[PDB]
Amino acid sequence: EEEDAGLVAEAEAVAAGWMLDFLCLSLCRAFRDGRSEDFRRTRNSAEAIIHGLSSLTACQLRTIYICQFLTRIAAGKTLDAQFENDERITPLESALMIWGSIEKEHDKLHEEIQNLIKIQAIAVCMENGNFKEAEEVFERIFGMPFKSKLLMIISQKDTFHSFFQHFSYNHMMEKIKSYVNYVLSEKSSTFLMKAAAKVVESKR
Amino acid sequence: EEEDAGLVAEAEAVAAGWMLDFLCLSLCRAFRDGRSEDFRRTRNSAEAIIHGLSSLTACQLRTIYICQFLTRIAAGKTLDAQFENDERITPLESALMIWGSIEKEHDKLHEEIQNLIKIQAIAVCMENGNFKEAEEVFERIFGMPFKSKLLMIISQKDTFHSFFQHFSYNHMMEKIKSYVNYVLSEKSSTFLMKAAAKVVESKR
Ligand SMILES: CN(C)C(=O)COc1cccc(F)c1
Ligand SMILES: CN(C)C(=O)COc1cccc(F)c1
Ligand SMILES: [Ca+2]
Ligand SMILES: [Ca+2]
Numbered sequence: 001e002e003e004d005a006g007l008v009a010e011a012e013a014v015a016a017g018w019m020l021d022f023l024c025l026s027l028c029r030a031f032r033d034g035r036s037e038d039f040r041r042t043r044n045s046a047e048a049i050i051h052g053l054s055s056l057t058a059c060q061l062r063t064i065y066i067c068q069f070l071t072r073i074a075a076g077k078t079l080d081a082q083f084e085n086d087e088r089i090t091p092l093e094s095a096l097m098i099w100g101s102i103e104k105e106h107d108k109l110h111e112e113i114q115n116l117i118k119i120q121a122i123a124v125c126m127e128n129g130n131f132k133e134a135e136e137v138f139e140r141i142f143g144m145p146f147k148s149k150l151l152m153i154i155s156q157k158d159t160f161h162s163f164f165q166h167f168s169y170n171h172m173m174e175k176i177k178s179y180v181n182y183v184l185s186e187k188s189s190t191f192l193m194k195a196a197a198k199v200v201e202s203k204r
Numbered sequence: 205e206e207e208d209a210g211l212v213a214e215a216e217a218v219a220a221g222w223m224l225d226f227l228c229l230s231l232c233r234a235f236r237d238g239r240s241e242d243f244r245r246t247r248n249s250a251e252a253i254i255h256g257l258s259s260l261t262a263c264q265l266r267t268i269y270i271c272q273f274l275t276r277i278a279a280g281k282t283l284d285a286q287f288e289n290d291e292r293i294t295p296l297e298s299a300l301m302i303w304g305s306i307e308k309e310h311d312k313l314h315e316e317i318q319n320l321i322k323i324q325a326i327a328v329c330m331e332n333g334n335f336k337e338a339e340e341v342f343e344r345i346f347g348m349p350f351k352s353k354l355l356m357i358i359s360q361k362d363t364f365h366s367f368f369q370h371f372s373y374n375h376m377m378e379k380i381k382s383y384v385n386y387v388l389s390e391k392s393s394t395f396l397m398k399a400a401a402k403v404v405e406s407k408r
Contacts, residue, residue, distance in 0.1 A: 008233065011400035015226050018396070022219050029212065038256075045252040052245045191399075192222070196215035 012052075017060060019049045022192035024063045028180050031070050043071055062103055066183055069098045073117075073176055076169070077124055079133075090137055092121035109179060115146070116172035122150055123164040131157050216256075221264060223253045226396035228267045232384050235274050247275055266307055270387055273302045277321075277380055280373070281328055283337075294341055296325035313383060319350070320376035326354055327368040335361050 023046040030039035046067050053060070072095035075081045083094040096117045104110065118141050125134035134154050142150070153161045187193070227250040234243035250271050257264070276299035279285045287298040300321045308314065322345050329338035338358050346354070357365045391397070 005237075007401070007404055010404045011397060012230055014400040014403050015396050018400075019223055019226075022223075026216055033209075041252070041256045045249070045256060048245070048249040048252045052242075052249060192219050192396075193215060195395075195399075196218040196222075197211070199218050200211055200214045 013054075016049060016053045017057075018190070018192045020046070020053065020060060020063055021187055021190040022196075023049060024067055025184065025187045025190065025193055027067055027070060028184050028187070031074065032177055032180050032184065036074075039070075039074060043067070043074075058103060063187075065098050065102045069095055069102070070176075070180070072098065073173075076120065079124065079128060079130065088136070089140075090121060090125070090133075092117050092124060093137060093140060096121065096141070109175065113172070113175050113179060116167060116175055118142075119150070119164065119167045120169050120172050122154065123169065126154070126161070126164070127159060129159060217258075220253060220257045221261075222394070222396045224250070224257065224264060224267055225391055225394040226400075227253060228271055229388065229391045229394065229397055231271055231274060232388050232391070235278065236381055236384050236388065240278075243274075243278060247271070247278075262307060267391075269302050269306045273299055273306070274380075274384070276302065277377075280324065283328065283332060283334065292340070293344075294325060294329070294337075296321050296328060297341060297344060300325065300345070313379065317376070317379050317383060320371060320379055322346075323354070323368065323371045324373050324376050326358065327373065330358070330365070330368070331363060333363060 023042060027039060027042045027046055029035075030042055050064055050067075056064070072083055072091045075083075075091040076095070078091060081091050083089065083091055084097075089097075096114065099110075099114055099117065121137050121141060122134050125131070125137055131154065138150060138154055149163060153163060227246060231243060231246045231250055233239075234246055254268055254271075260268070276287055276295045279287075279295040280299070282295060285295050287293065287295055288301075293301075300318065303314075303318055303321065325341050325345060326338050329335070329341055335358065342354060342358055353367060357367060
């Protein structure tokens with residue numbers, strides 16, 4: 001009885017791992033495609049499946065961080081959303097923290113996404129008229145020429161600035177979508193998606 | 205692009221179907237074993253996966269009803285839980301409604317579980333001192349000798365009665381566990397559990 005129970009629990013852990021990779025792939029595709037409601041529903045499923053996983057491999061931790069990063073980016077303009085125990089941390093700041101924790105290459109794209117998130121973390125506060133919060137986010141992030149231009153913009157209390165039109169929220173989203181395309185390619189061959197794709201192809 | 209999108213959506217539907225069967229099996233096992241926290245976490249995952257499924261086969265509807273039935277039975281003593289749009293319906297009444305909707309054989313076990321749920325739907329109200337609610341549940345359920353004994357018990361306003369000790373909440377749970385054992389046997393061979401069990405066995 002106990003031997004059977006143990007084998008069943010190990011099989012549930014294997015299946016949970018396969019579901020996590022499949023849900024990450026689906027969440028990435030919904031983000032890339034701009035399918036907002038599919039992203040919301042897939043995120044709910046990913047969160048629930050994660051709470052049923054205990055021990056994680058390095059690969060599983062990376063997959064969970066990708067899901068959490070895209071969720072924060074999707075909520076980047078939702079300044080009322082609290083992703084950290086410290087209630088002061090804004091969604092784009094929480095995304096920046098995960099971006100710097102992921103075991104991944106720090107290539108030119110990595111640094112461009114990092115810097116776009118830093119700029120937009122301040123811009124979203126400015127656009128809402130949250131000038132004091134924009135200064136507080138600046139202090140937490142920055143923690144020379146890039147930094148000084150941002151402080152000057154914050155000090156001018158201007159809800160819109162041409163610098164934010166050049167390094168825009170849309171530009172940040174497009175660069176992140178380029179990275180998501182790489183994750184989609186990498187995870188397309190995981191077990192559950194491969195098996196489901198083989199079934200759909202067999203019926204055509 | 206649209207052809208690829210369509211094939212991807214069909215593969216996601218196949219994978220969702222496999223996840224639903226696996227989560228039903230896991231929910232059944234946690235119920236049978238009395239693993240309350242595993243049941244709670246698995247139920248959260250099942251609910252989320254169900255919201256991402258649109259069209260359902262008759263087999264998938266039956267699987268969803270089994271999950272919903274066990275969730276109501278697990279909440280049978282939680283009189284503050286509202287499972288229906290009509291806020292008056294108690295959890296055991298909602299379980300009885302699903303039990304009568306499932307496409308399944310109406311064998312002797314089916315009728316014994318049905319009658320135990322009817323008795324306990326009144327008993328749980330009585331045990332809480334909700335005498336008027338017990339009479340209202342009685343009217344909705346009943347909807348001759350079994351019925352008349354129940355009305356007599358309700359009219360006596362006795363928080364405990366020997367009739368409820370004979371056809372007890374524990375007796376109802378044990379009969380339902382006998383049925384769950386049949387569902388476990390039937391669903392053990394579904395795709396995801398079979399594949400995960402093969403992986404665990406291969407490593408032994
Ligand atoms: C701090 N919290 C509650 C979160 O990170 C919720 O977001 C998540 C969590 C996991 C997967 C996912 F796709 C999204
Ligand atoms: C009326 N509501 C919200 C429900 O029935 C929730 O319960 C559920 C639903 C689906 C699967 C499950 F395992 C449990
Ligand atoms: Ca806020
Ligand atoms: Ca109530």
